[PDB]
Amino acid sequence: HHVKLQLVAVGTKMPDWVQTGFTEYLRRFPKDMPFELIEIPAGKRGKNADIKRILDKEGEQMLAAAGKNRIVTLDIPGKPWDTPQLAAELERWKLDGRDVSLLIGGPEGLSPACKAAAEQSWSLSALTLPHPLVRVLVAESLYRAWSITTNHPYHRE
Amino acid sequence: HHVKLQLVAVGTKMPDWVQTGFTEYLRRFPKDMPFELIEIPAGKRGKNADIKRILDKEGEQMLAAAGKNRIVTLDIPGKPWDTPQLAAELERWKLDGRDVSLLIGGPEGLSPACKAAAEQSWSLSALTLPHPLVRVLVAESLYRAWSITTNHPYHRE
Ligand SMILES: C[S@@+](CC[C@H](N)C(=O)[O-])C[C@H]1O[C@@H](n2cnc3c(N)ncnc32)[C@H](O)[C@@H]1O
Ligand SMILES: C[S@@+](CC[C@H](N)C(=O)[O-])C[C@H]1O[C@@H](n2cnc3c(N)ncnc32)[C@H](O)[C@@H]1O
Numbered sequence A, B: 001h002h003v004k005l006q007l008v009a010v011g012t013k014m015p016d017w018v019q020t021g022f023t024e025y026l027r028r029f030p031k032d033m034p035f036e037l038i039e040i041p042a043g044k045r046g047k048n049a050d051i052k053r054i055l056d057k058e059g060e061q062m063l064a065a066a067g068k069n070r071i072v073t074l075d076i077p078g079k080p081w082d083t084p085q086l087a088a089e090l091e092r093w094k095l096d097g098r099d100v101s102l103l104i105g106g107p108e109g110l111s112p113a114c115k116a117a118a119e120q121s122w123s124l125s126a127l128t129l130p131h132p133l134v135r136v137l138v139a140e141s142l143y144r145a146w147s148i149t150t151n152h153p154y155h156r157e
Helices: A016-026 A051-066 A083-096 A112-117 A131-149 B016-026 B051-066 B083-096 B112-117 B131-149
Strands: A005-010 A035-040 A070-079 A100-104 A120-122 B005-010 B035-040 B070-079 B100-104 B120-122
Touching: A005 A051, A005 A131, A016 A035, A016 A131, A016 B016, A035 A051, A035 A131, A051 A100, A051 A112, A070 A083, A070 A112, A083 A131, A100 A131, A131 B131, B005 B051, B005 B131, B016 B035, B016 B131, B035 B051, B035 B131, B051 B100, B051 B112, B070 B083, B070 B112, B083 B131, B100 B131
Parallel strands: A005 A035, A005 A100, A070 A100, A070 A120, B005 B035, B005 B100, B070 B100, B070 B120
Antiparallel strands: none
């Protein structure tokens, strides 16, 4: 009865250094808090493409991936959680008992349906961050939040 | 070479993926806005060490590297600039004409003198970020800010 953290993200080819950095954090998560990545393919964009519909198809794929999971969106206008707050949230998710889906939008951001479906929305920064860096920050900050919950040396070194 | 952006940062041994990611951004700044790294070595800490002094000695070195430059600290309680705001600031630094020293603290954070010396302070996140990731986020966000000022393709879509 341990909870799963699922990063649901649009885009499939992280630069090598980003994937290396992401894996170094992902792998340090304990067996009772598995951290896993689900990549959704980005819709093909063009001037002749209807951008709303491309975005909705992306969102539909994300929400389908989340299933019945608790839905948390990564979004610039979400809650600017500090590290103690994220640790408190991480603890709340565990009591809740449901797996958590963390949603990272593609180039055009999150679909309206995804923003609407969010039970919580989490802002990493007031800055517009590139999708690969969002992946790494989420992994690192959750790791730091987790290490606070178990008094692991990482959060205090 | 009108204004130079110099990152003054405590710590010397970045993980490889971090140096790769950091350089990837650094090498893309144009010759007329050079982005450079100055590393101050971290003081050797021990449970018998005077942290107050170690911190002062780090700051002393930082402030020496900055010289007469515009001094901007990276600090959690600084200004939570969004990306357009950072572009405007970058534009204001160019008008000022002074090179900009961007200060990143060591394991114990910035010295009292460095915080005192700051003309501006810049917050990347409400999160407690690890020193390597601060380096990468500063390089990318300034690169994105630069690309906005020059109507470069990086920041669009
Ligand atoms: C390049 S951004 C596109 C942002 C989009 N134009 C918007 O305003 O919603 C791609 C995705 O990364 C995530 N992201 C980028 N910056 C973020 C931030 N500062 N805080 C939280 N999530 C962020 C969001 O999930 C976003 O959908
Ligand atoms: C290990 S952190 C220390 C965290 C915290 N600022 C402190 O004083 O203990 C090292 C440095 O990274 C920078 N830093 C960490 N998180 C930051 C954030 N969210 N925004 C801007 N700078 C940050 C600060 O310059 C800090 O001195």
